[PDB]
Amino acid sequence: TRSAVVLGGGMAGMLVSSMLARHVGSVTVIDRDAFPAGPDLRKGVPQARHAHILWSGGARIVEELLPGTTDRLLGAGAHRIGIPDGQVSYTAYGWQHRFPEAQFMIACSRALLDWTVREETLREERIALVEKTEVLALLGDAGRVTGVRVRDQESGEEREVPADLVVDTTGRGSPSKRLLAELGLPAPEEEFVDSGMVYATRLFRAPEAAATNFPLVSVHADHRAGRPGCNAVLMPIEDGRWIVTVSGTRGGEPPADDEGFARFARDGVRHPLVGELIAKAQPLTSVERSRSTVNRRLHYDRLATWPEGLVVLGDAVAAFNPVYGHGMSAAAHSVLALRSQLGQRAFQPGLARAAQRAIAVAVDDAWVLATSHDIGYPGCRTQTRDPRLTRHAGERQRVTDLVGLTATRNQVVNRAAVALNTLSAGMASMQDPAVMAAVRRGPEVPAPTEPPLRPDEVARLVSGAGVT
Ligand SMILES: Cc1cc2nc3c(=O)[nH]c(=O)nc-3n(C[C@H](O)[C@H](O)[C@H](O)COP(=O)(O)OP(=O)(O)OC[C@H]3O[C@@H](n4cnc5c(N)ncnc54)[C@H](O)[C@@H]3O)c2cc1C
Numbered sequence: 001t002r003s004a005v006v007l008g009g010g011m012a013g014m015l016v017s018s019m020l021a022r023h024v025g026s027v028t029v030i031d032r033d034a035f036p037a038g039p040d041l042r043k044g045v046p047q048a049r050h051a052h053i054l055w056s057g058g059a060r061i062v063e064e065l066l067p068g069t070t071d072r073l074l075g076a077g078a079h080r081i082g083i084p085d086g087q088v089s090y091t092a093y094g095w096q097h098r099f100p101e102a103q104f105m106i107a108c109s110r111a112l113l114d115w116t117v118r119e120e121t122l123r124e125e126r127i128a129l130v131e132k133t134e135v136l137a138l139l140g141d142a143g144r145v146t147g148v149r150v151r152d153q154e155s156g157e158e159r160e161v162p163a164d165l166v167v168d169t170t171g172r173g174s175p176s177k178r179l180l181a182e183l184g185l186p187a188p189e190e191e192f193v194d195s196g197m198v199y200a201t202r203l204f205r206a207p208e209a210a211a212t213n214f215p216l217v218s219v220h221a222d223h224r225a226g227r228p229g230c231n232a233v234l235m236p237i238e239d240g241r242w243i244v245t246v247s248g249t250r251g252g253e254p255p256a257d258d259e260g261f262a263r264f265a266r267d268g269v270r271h272p273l274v275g276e277l278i279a280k281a282q283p284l285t286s287v288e289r290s291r292s293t294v295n296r297r298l299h300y301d302r303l304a305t306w307p308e309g310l311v312v313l314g315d316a317v318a319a320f321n322p323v324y325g326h327g328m329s330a331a332a333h334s335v336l337a338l339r340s341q342l343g344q345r346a347f348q349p350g351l352a353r354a355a356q357r358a359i360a361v362a363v364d365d366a367w368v369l370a371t372s373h374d375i376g377y378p379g380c381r382t383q384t385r386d387p388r389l390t391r392h393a394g395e396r397q398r399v400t401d402l403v404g405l406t407a408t409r410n411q412v413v414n415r416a417a418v419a420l421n422t423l424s425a426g427m428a429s430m431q432d433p434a435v436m437a438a439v440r441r442g443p444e445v446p447a448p449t450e451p452p453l454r455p456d457e458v459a460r461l462v463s464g465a466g467v468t
């Protein structure tokens, strides 16, 4: 009994659908895109052209909702990369010492991740994916949503899809503001922090011996410097490839051409390591760019009126500058927040509002982490009432940098920093007396003076051909 309609069948839509089918009799997923039968790019998820990191915090939730998915990804060529043992990272504060594993991430093409999650989700016969379908309107009124009116793209026929619960997971281009406007509801407060970040990506075939057991490599901006922030990330993915994504804020955006890409990876960022490694590899694709990098949040949970049976989650409610890599994990946390309110409240009145408030809490750490680091770049454009961003940003950055600095050279501080940065723990965890204690104890290793690559890692950058 009871039925749910999910708008958007991307990451949040698939995750929330898998959860919902354990609580309602049927789930219908409505998407305007066409869906490939295999792990291919598609127009509805254009960000899949760029490096995607699935931090442990999100990965564990994906596993809970769709168990066996992590192993299926690894079996398809995804990499499990330990953090910080599997990363060579020139942070704002210097090189990260590669301490033993504290957290992890899963590294693969977003196309493969999306295909795997969708295939696992649709194993549940009571979830149906309705492709090539437009979302026209929410049915019902401002007091209660009762479904959606859709248009079939092939036939042009419009029809009404009844639902006890509608979940908007249509992503960064969600039309929910319009949909809610047509209901008569007031417009939500919108908050944004826009650093002008632009991403540029190329795929490379790695040297054959480095197709496995190769680290994540990153060169980060120094957000404390009053200069445009530029970054470079090299990430292993399936089938012996490296995805390389460079980025820059206003005044340091990467160029669009193949040659400028390589020079940006060498000279536009603070250390040339990513430039040096891609020179060992074979380029497979030309530069793809994205500017879908604004931190944008819609405070739907604070609206004066909220209709029963409507919930918005994923990028549709809060989307981030992706250099921090939180979007998919934040959506996963938001799904568990809805599940928690469903378990407590079932379908009583109050459910949708309670879930919307719970979702706002679930994305808040990801929101604070991304905006607090973006707000310092030259030229940043903002619209906010958040005192964390307007006033208390000065000391929040003073304590962030003490922890960030000490995390590069102290195993206990690093463990706590990466627990938070992978969304495996909340921000209160940093106020644990033991963590503040380790911070005060400071570095236990020297600061590396060169990239902390292993000899065996660099040895696999050449074939050894040409030698008798
Ligand atoms: C360049 C870039 C890099 C990123 N890197 C990372 C990273 O490293 N780690 C990470 O965790 N996140 C990353 N992200 C964020 C991540 O892509 C998103 O957070 C994630 O896709 C959110 O899922 P979603 O389901 O809300 O949206 P999406 O996955 O985009 O899915 C939206 C779905 O809704 C459909 N749709 C859209 N509009 C409509 C409509 N009007 N009607 C019907 N259907 C509609 C689309 O076709 C699609 O199927 C990155 C994003 C970008 C842009």
Ligand SMILES: [Cl-]
Residues within 6 Å of the ligand: 046, 047, 048, 289, 290, 291, 292
């Ligand atoms: Cl994009």
